Design a protein around this ligand. Structure first.
Ligand SMILES: Nc1ncnc2c1ncn2[C@@H]1O[C@H](COP(=O)(O)OP(=O)(O)O)[C@@H](O)[C@H]1O
Ligand code: BEF
Ligand SMILES: [Mg+2]
Lengths: 93, 80, 107, 95, 504, 107, 93, 88, 98
DNA sequence: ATCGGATGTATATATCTGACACGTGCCTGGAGACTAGGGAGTAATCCCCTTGGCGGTTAAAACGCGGGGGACAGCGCGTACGTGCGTTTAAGCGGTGCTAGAGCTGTCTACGACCAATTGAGCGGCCTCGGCACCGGGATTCTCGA
DNA sequence: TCGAGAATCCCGGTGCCGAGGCCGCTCAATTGGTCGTAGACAGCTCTAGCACCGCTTAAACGCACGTACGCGCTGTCCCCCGCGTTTTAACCGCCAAGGGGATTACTCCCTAGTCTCCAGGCACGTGTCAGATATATACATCCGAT
C-alpha cells in the first residue's frame, strides 16, 4: 500500500540551494509536516475568504490575500512576487 | 500628527482603575501608548487587507470582527 | 500528442497537479480555479527554499554536511520572521537556543 | 482631605460597577484614521467599525492591566512600573 | 577455503548423492567447478595425558570428533545430557595439545552459571592449560584484555552470552581454532543479536554442543545448522522447501528417511537408557491437584472482569499467576504485617501437597530441588522454608557471580544439612551439577518441554546412585492442563523423529 | 399529505431544516447524514437554555426585567465551565467582574 | 433583501425558561453571535473528524464526538444526553 | 524472612525523579532551585497529560480502534494549539 | 585539601551542557507507566504504540522547558535567583491556564 | 476605640418616552413523494506488532554530610505620586447639506466540472560506501587557593 | 599574589549503518473534447458617511503640598549545593502467545437530486410601559479630636 509525501521535491529544492549538503530522514519528516501545515493554513484562509464574500471559486486572488494575511513581514512581499511571476509565466506558456 | 496624545492621562488612569491598579507610576503612559499603537496597527492591517480584497473602499464592522477573530480575540455583539 | 507536466510550464519544482487534486478533494470550496494551484505551489517552494537555506548555513556552522533536526531548530528560532510564523510549533528532537540569563553569570 | 489610597479604591469600585467606554470618541477616531493612512489612502469607516475597535482596545488594555497588577504584587509592591508591563507581554508571547 | 571445500567434499560426496542434489539446487558460484572434478575423478586406548579415566563409549565420542577434524568439517555433539560432554571436549583439546601439538587460541562460550564448572574440570583433567573466567565490570575487563589477552598468554578463554556481545571489538582481532558453544539454544534464531556477532569471527572448526536438538520447528534446527557450515548450506527457503516440514501435504514419512540419513554422518547422539552409566532409570508423576477455596473466588474475579480497576491485557499470564499462588495479586495478602501463620499453605493449592510431601521426604532422608518459571514466586517459597525452618540456597537471575559458586558447593558439600534448593528454570538448571540430590519437583510447567527436560535430568546423571522421582504439580481444570497438553503436542512431533535417526 | 416540520416531530424549538441547509451549503463535508441536524440543533438549544437561565437569574438579582449585556457578562464569567468555553471572547458592552486584590485593601 | 437570524428561537427558549422576562436588542445580537460561533466550532471539528478517517459523511457519531471534544466537563454529559434524547424521539416518529 | 511483599511502593507520579526535574530546569536556564518545585511540577505535568490523553482516547474511540497511534496524539496536540512536527 | 568548587559553578556548566544536547531527559519506563496509569481512567484495556509514547514524551518535555523559562523570568523579576512555587503559579496564571 | 462630622451612597416618589412586544401580508425556502447509485457495513483472512516477564550489566538515583551563599526582616530616607483647587479647551449635541459609493438587477460568455483514452512520474524494494560516531592521546582553558 | 588540578577542545584512527542511487511496476496526471453557469460588467438608485457651524459644559491641564512607599543597606540563619558511597531499577536482548490492524468482496439502503406545493418566517406599522432621570430623604463610611 503506497503512501505519498513531498520528499523528492524537498530534495530537489535542497539540491538547488546547497549543491552538497544532504539531509537526514527525521528532518525529511519534519519538512514534510511543515509543508502539510502551511498548505492547510493557506487553504483554510482562502476558503473562508471565498465564503465571506459569497463567492464560490478559489482563484489566485484569494490565495494572494491568504498569503498576505498569514505570512509576516518580508515573507509576504517575496511570496507575492514569486507567485505572481509563476502565474505570469504559466499563462504565457 | 500627535493624535496619539488624544489617549490622555486620565483615560489611561480610568483604564487602570477598571483593571484593579491602585497606584500608578509616571512612566506607564508612554509604554501604554506604544502597546495600544501596536495593537491597533495589527488589527487595522488585517481589516484593510479584507477591505482591499473585497474591492471596496469602506471598512465595515464585519471586517473588524473578522480581523479580531483572525488574531484570536473573538468579538460578540456587532453582527455575526 | 506529447504530454508535458504543468510544473515544467510554471518552472516550479513542487507538483502542481497534486496540489490541484488536494484542493479539489479537500472540500475547501465548490470550484477551484485554474490559477490557484500554480500560485500555491510557488509559495510553498519559496518557504521550503528559505528554511532549507538557513538550515544549510547552520549545518555548515558546525562542520556537518547532513541536516539533523537540531539544525532546523536553530535555523527557525534564530530567524525573526520564521519564528513569528512557527511560534506555536514544537519541533521534535529540537532543543533550545543557548541562552543564559544575564544576572546568573558570576561577578 | 482624604488619605492617599481612598479615592483610588472608591474609583475602582465605581469603574468596575459600570459598563460604558472610557476613552473619548473623537481622539480615538482620529487615531484610527491616522493609523489607517499608512496602508491604503482615502479610506472610509462605518461608525460601528470604530465602535468595534474601541471596544476591543478597551478589553485588551483592561486584561493587560490585570496581569500587570498581578506581576507588581508578585514583586512585593503596589505601584505598577513599565518593567511589569514588559514582563506581562513577555510571558503571553507578544515578544 | 577452496582446498578445504574439496576436502569437505571428500567425505560428503563419499556419502549418497543427495549432496549432488543439494549443491546443484541453487536459485551458484564456482563450487560447481570443483564439484565436477571429484564427480568425474584411531586413538582407541583412553590416552592418559588426562588425569583420570575415560568411558568406553566416550572414547567413541572422542574419535568421532577427531574424524570431523581429519575431514576438516564441523559437527554437533548432541549427546543426551548428564553423559559427560565436557570430558569429551577437554580431551579433544588435549588431543591437539599432545598429539597434533597445537595449543592454540580456543574460545568457549557457556551460560553464566556454568563458567566455573569448565575451569574446575580443566584443572581436574588437563592442568597444563592456561584458562580464564572472563568476569568483571568494565574496569575489571580492562586489565584482562590489555594484560593477558592482547599479550597472547593463554590457551582457553571462557566467556558468556552477554560478555561476547559487549567485547566483540577486542575479539575480532584474534584468530581462532575453535568456537565451542555449550547450550546451543540461544542460536535457535537467525536474526538474534548473538548469532549476528558469531558469524563475524574467524574459526577453523565449531564444535557446537547441545543436550537437546530443535525445540519447535524445522526452522530452528537449520538455523543452528547454518552457522555450522555456511559455505555448504547458505540456504533459507530452499532447505525449507526441500523437506516441506515433515510431509505436511502428503503425510508420507518417507522423505523423512533422507533427513535421518543427512544428519547421521553429521551429528552424534547417544541415549542415557542405551548406555546406562547409572544402572537405574527415573520415575515421574503428575500430581493433578485442585484449586483451593480462596482462589476459586480469584478465578472468578478475572474471567468476569470484576482485584479490579487494573490492567489484564494478557489473561494467559494473569490466570497463570492464580494457578500457581494467590499472593501475587497485591490484595490477597490481608494484614498490615501481611501476617505470618499456617494460612499460607492454607490459601495455596500446591503448597498443601508440598507441605505434606516434604514431611514425607524429610523423614526418609531425601533432598529435593524446587524449580519455577517466575522469580517472584520463589520469594514466597523462601518465607515458607523459613517458616518450616529448612536450610537452602536460592540461585536466581541476577544474584551474583561468586555467590552462585558458593551456594553450589554448599549444597554439593558432603554431609551438608541443606534440604531444599530453590532454582529457576531459565537461569538455574542449564548445566550446573547437582548429583547430591535425589528427587526433583517442578512447581509449574513451561511453554517448552525441552526446557523442563533440560531441568529434569539435573540430578539424574553420572554419579547419582539413588532413584530419581520427579513430581510435577498441575492445577486441575485450569490453564495448566491446556499448557501441558499444548506442550505435549510439541514433544511428539519432535521425539518421534529423533527416535528414528539414531536407529536408521 | 399533511405537512409537519422536523423541529416539531423531533420535539425541539430551534429549527432543523435551517441547520441542515447550513450544513450542506457550508462545505463541511460532501454528504450530510439525516440524523446530524437533529443532534446539532438539540446541542445548540441546550447551550442557549443554559445561558438564558443564568442571565435571567442575574437580571433578577439587580431587579431588572430585561436583559442587558452586563447580565450576560456576569452569567458567563461567574460559571466555571461557561468561562472555560468562552475563555477568549469579548462580549461587547460587557464590563469586568468586581475584583479587588487582598493586599490593596487598607488594614 | 432579507437577513436571517436566530432571534425568534432564542425568544421561544427564553419564554420557556423565564416566562416573565424580556430581552434587549443588543443581548439578542450577542446570543445570535454565540449561536453562530458554537455552530461553526462544532461543524468544523466534525468536518475534520470525517476527513481524518477517510469517510465522506457527517453522521450523528461525528457530532457526538465533536461535542465531547469541545464542551468541557459537565456540559458534555448533558449535551450528549439531550442530543441522544432528541435523535431517539425523532427516529421512532 | 518476609521478603515476598516488600516492594509495592512506586506511585508512578513519583517515577518522575528529582534529578529529572533538575535536568529539565537546567535546560530551561534555571540556576538554583528551591526544594518545593518538585511537587508542583509533578502536578502540572499530570494535568497536561490528562488533557492530551483525554483527547487522544476520544480520537481513538471514534475510529472504533483500541490502539492509540501517533497520529491520534498529533491530532490531540494540534487540537490544543501545540503543533508537533515529526510524526506525520 | 581536595578541589571543591564554589556553589554555582557546576550549575552553570550543567546549563551549558544540557542546552547543547538534544536527547530526552526523562527515563522511558517510568514515563510510560505514568501514561498508562493516566489512561486507565478514560477507557480500560487500551494498547499504545511506541511512537505515541515518544510523541507524548517529546511534547511534555517541551512544555516543561518552556514553563521553566517563564518561571525563571518571573523569579529574576522578583530580584531573586531561586524559582519557587508561587513563581510557577504566577507564570501559569498569566498565560491563562488556571 | 469612640464620637461627632462631613460626605458619598443608596432609597423612595413622580414623570416622560422611545425601545420592545405584537398583529398582517406576502414569498420563498422547507416538506412530501419518488428514483438511482455509490458509500459503507459486515464477513472473512492474514500477519505484524504489542504485551509480559526473565537474565545480566551498569549507570543513575538515594542518602548522608559539611558549609557557605542567598532569602528575609528590619531601618531609614527621600522623592514621587495622590488630592484638591482654579483655569482653559476641546468633546459632545444638534443641525444642515452634499455626494461617493454600497447595493441591486439584467445580460452575455469565458471557464471549470465531467469523462474517455493514453502513459511516464513517482513509489516500493534492494544494494553500497562514506559521513558521522566513538577512541584515545595531546594541547589548551578555566576556576580556586595563593 | 600565579600556579595547579580538572574540564574542554581538537587531531588522527577505525568502523558501520543509514542516506544515495538504480530498477521495475502502475496508477494518477495529462490531453482532448462538451456544456451549463458563476462571474464580469454596465447601469441605476438611495443612504449613510463626510464636512462644517454654533452653543454648552464637563473634563483635562497646571500647580502646590504632604506623606507613604520604593529602594538601598545590615545582619542573621538555614537550605540547597557539592560530593562520596551504596542500592536499585532502567536498558537491551530473548522468548513465548495472540489480539487486533489492515485488507478485500459483496450487497444494500441512505442520501443527493427533482418536482410540486404551501405555510413559517420576515419586513412593516403601532400601542404602551420599563427604565432613565430629577428630587427629596435616610444611612453607611472614613477621619480628626480626644
Ligand atoms: N569418566 C568419568 N568419570 C567420572 N565422572 C564423569 C566422567 N565423565 C563425566 N563425568 C561426570 O559428568 C559430570 C559433568 O558432565 P557434563 O559435561 O555436565 O555432561 P552433560 O554436559 O552432558 O550434562 C561431572 O560431574 C563428572 O563427574
Ligand atoms: F550441558 Be550439561 F547438561 F551440563
Ligand atoms: Mg555440560
Amino acid at each position: 500500500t503506497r503512501k505519498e509525501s513531498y520528499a523528492i521535491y524537498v530534495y530537489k529544492v535542497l539540491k538547488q540551494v546547497h549543491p552538497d549538503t544532504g539531509i537526514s530522514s527525521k528532518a525529511m519528516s519534519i519538512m514534510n509536516s511543515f509543508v502539510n501545515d502551511v498548505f492547510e493554513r493557506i487553504a483554510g484562509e482562502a476558503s473562508r475568504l471565498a465564503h465571506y464574500n459569497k463567492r464560490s471559486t478559489i482563484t489566485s486572488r484569494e490565495i494572494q490575500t491568504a498569503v498576505r494575511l498569514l505570512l509576516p513581514g518580508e515573507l509576504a512581499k517575496h511570496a507575492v512576487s514569486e507567485g505572481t511571476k509563476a502565474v505570469t509565466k504559466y499563462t504565457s506558456a | 500628527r500627535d493624535n496619539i496624545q488624544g489617549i490622555t492621562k486620565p483615560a489611561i488612569r480610568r483604564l487602570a482603575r477598571r483593571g484593579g491598579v491602585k497606584r500608578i507610576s509616571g512612566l506607564i503612559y508612554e509604554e501604554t501608548r506604544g502597546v495600544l499603537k501596536v495593537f491597533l496597527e495589527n488589527v487595522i492591517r488585517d481589516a484593510v487587507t479584507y477591505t482591499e480584497h473585497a474591492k471596496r473602499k469602506t471598512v465595515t464592522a464585519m471586517d473588524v470582527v473578522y480581523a479580531l477573530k483572525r488574531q484570536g480575540r473573538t468579538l460578540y455583539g456587532f453582527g455575526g | 500528442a506529447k504530454a508535458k507536466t504543468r510544473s515544467s510550464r510554471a518552472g516550479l519544482q513542487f507538483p502542481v497537479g497534486r496540489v490541484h487534486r488536494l484542493l479539489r478533494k479537500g472540500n475547501y470550496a465548490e470550484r477551484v480555479g485554474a490559477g490557484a494551484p500554480v500560485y500555491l505551489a510557488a509559495v510553498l517552494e519559496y518557504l521550503t527554499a528559505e528554511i532549507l537555506e538557513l538550515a544549510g548555513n547552520a549545518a555548515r556552522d558546525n562542520k556537518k554536511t547532513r541536516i539533523i533536526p537540531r539544525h532546523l531548530q536553530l535555523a527557525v528560532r534564530n530567524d525573526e520572521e520564521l519564528n513569528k510564523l512557527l511560534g506555536r510549533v514544537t519541533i521534535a528532537q529540537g532543543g533550545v537556543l543557548p541562552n543564559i540569563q544575564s544576572v546568573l553569570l558570576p561577578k | 482631605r482624604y488619605r492617599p489610597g481612598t479615592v483610588a479604591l472608591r474609583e475602582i469600585r465605581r469603574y468596575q460597577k459600570s459598563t460604558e467606554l472610557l476613552i473619548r470618541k473623537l481622539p480615538f477616531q482620529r487615531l484610527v484614521r491616522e493609523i489607517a493612512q499608512d496602508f491604503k489612502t482615502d479610506l472610509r469607516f462605518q461608525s460601528s467599525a470604530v465602535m468595534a475597535l474601541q471596544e476591543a482596545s478597551e478589553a485588551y488594555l483592561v486584561a493587560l492591566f490585570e496581569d500587570t497588577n498581578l506581576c507588581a504584587i508578585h514583586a512585593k509592591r503596589v505601584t505598577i512600573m513599565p518593567k511589569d508591563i514588559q514582563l506581562a507581554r513577555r510571558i503571553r508571547g507578544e515578544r | 577455503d577452496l582446498e578445504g571445500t574439496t576436502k569437505r567434499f571428500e567425505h560428503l560426496l563419499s556419502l549418497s548423492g543427495l549432496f549432488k542434489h543439494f549443491i546443484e539446487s541453487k536459485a551458484d558460484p564456482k563450487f560447481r567447478q570443483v564439484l565436477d572434478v571429484l564427480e568425474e575423478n584411531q586413538f582407541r586406548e583412553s590416552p592418559a595425558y588426562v588425569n583420570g579415566q575415560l568411558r568406553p563409549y566416550q572414547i567413541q565420542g572422542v574419535n568421532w570428533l577427531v574424524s570431523l577434524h581429519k575431514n576438516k568439517i564441523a559437527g554437533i555433539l548432541a549427546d543426551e545430557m548428564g553423559l559427560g560432554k565436557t570430558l569429551q571436549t577437554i580431551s579433544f583439546l588435549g588431543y591437539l595439545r599432545y598429539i597434533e601439538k597445537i595449543p592454540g587460541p580456543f574460545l568457549v562460550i557457556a551460560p553464566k552459571s556454568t563458567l566455573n564448572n569448565w575451569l574446575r574440570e580443566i584443572n581436574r583433567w588437563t592442568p597444563d592449560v592456561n584458562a580464564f573466567i572472563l568476569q568483571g565490570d568494565k574496569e575489571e575487563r580492562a586489565e584482562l584484555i590489555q594484560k593477558k589477552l592482547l599479550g597472547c598468554d593463554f590457551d582457553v578463554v571462557i566467556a558468556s552470552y552477554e560478555i561476547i556481545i559487549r567485547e566483540k571489538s577486542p575479539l575480532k582481532k584474534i584468530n581462532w581454532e575453535y568456537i565451542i558453544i555449550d547450550e546451543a539454544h540461544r542460536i535457535k534464531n537467525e536474526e538474534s543479536m548473538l548469532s549476528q556477532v558469531l558469524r563475524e569471527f574467524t574459526s577453523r572448526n565449531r564444535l557446537l554442543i547441545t543436550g537437546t536438538p530443535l525445540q519447535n520447528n524445522l526452522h530452528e534446527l537449520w538455523a543452528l545448522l547454518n552457522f555450522l557450515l555456511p559455505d555448504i548450506f547458505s540456504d533459507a527457503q530452499d532447505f525449507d522447501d526441500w523437506f516441506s516440514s515433515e510431509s505436511t501435504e502428503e503425510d508420507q514419512d518417507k522423505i523423512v528417511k533422507q533427513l535421518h540419513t543427512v544428519l547421521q554422518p553429521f551429528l552424534l547422539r547417544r541415549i542415557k537408557s542405551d548406555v546406562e552409566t547409572s544402572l537405574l532409570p527415573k520415575k515421574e508423576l503428575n500430581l493433578y491437584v485442585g484449586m483451593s477455596s480462596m482462589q476459586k473466588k480469584w478465578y472468578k474475579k478475572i474471567l468476569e472482569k470484576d482485584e479490579s480497576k487494573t490492567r489484564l491485557l494478557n489473561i494467559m499470564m494473569q490466570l497463570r499467576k492464580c494457578c500457581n499462588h494467590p499472593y501475587l495479586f497485591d490484595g490477597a495478602e490481608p494484614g498490615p504485617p501481611y501476617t505470618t501463620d499456617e494460612h499460607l499453605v492454607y490459601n495455596a493449592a500446591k503448597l498443601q501437597v508440598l507441605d505434606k510431601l516434604l514431611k514425607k521426604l524429610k523423614e526418609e532422608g531425601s533432598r529435593v530441588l524446587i524449580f519455577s518459571q517466575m522469580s517472584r514466586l520463589l520469594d514466597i517459597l523462601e518465607d515458607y522454608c523459613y517458616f518450616r525452618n529448612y536450610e537452602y540456597c536460592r540461585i536466581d537471575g541476577s544474584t551474583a557471580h561468586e555467590d552462585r559458586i558458593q551456594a553450589i558447593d554448599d549444597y554439593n558439600a558432603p554431609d551438608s544439612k541443606k534440604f531444599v534448593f530453590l532454582l529457576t528454570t531459565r537461569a538455574g538448571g542449564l548445566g550446573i551439577n547437582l548429583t547430591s540430590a535425589d528427587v526433583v519437583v517442578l512447581y509449574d510447567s513451561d511453554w517448552n518441554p525441552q526446557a523442563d527436560l533440560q531441568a529434569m535430568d539435573r540430578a539424574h546423571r553420572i554419579g547419582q546412585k539413588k532413584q530419581v522421582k520427579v513430581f510435577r504439580l498441575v492445577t486441575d481444570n485450569s490453564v495448566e492442563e491446556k499448557i501441558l497438553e499444548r506442550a505435549t503436542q510439541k514433544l511428539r512431533l519432535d521425539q518421534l523423529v529423533i527416535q528414528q535417526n539414531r536407529t536408521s
